[PDB]
Amino acid sequence: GPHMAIHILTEKEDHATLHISFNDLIKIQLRTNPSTGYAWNIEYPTDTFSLSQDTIKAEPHPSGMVGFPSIREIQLKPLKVGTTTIKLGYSRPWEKGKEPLRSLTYSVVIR
């Protein structure tokens, strides 16, 4: 085993189950388009993970348009061992009566 591992999750890993170690990190890396008012919202057990870093960054290419899309990166560090579900929804904050355009679900076992 390593000192620690960083596990990268993207849209493509929807419904994945990840087994990680106590001292590992999860990095969720998603594309996003802030110019539209949409953003990813994350739901996770706050007793089990700490938000180590949350970033939105403008992406270089394809230019294309040079600045679109953007990248959302959410890093989570285990606080406790256990089994968790992380859910993300891509939606508009103040929009009423609508479901997220896209939803992601990950199962994470911290052993």
Which residues contact Cl ion (rule: CB under 5 A)?
32, 39-40, 72
The residue among 33, 7, 19, 9 whose CA lies nearest residue 88 is 9
Instruction: Give me the amino acid identity at 76.
Output: L
18 versus 39: smaller Cβ distance to Cl ion: 39
Quote the least distance from Cβ 39 to Cl ion, whole Å. Answer: 4
The residue among 103, 39, 91, 24 whose CA lies nearest residue 70 is 39
Quote the least distance from Cβ 3 to Cl ion, whole Å. Answer: 30
71 versus 109: smaller Cβ distance to Cl ion: 71
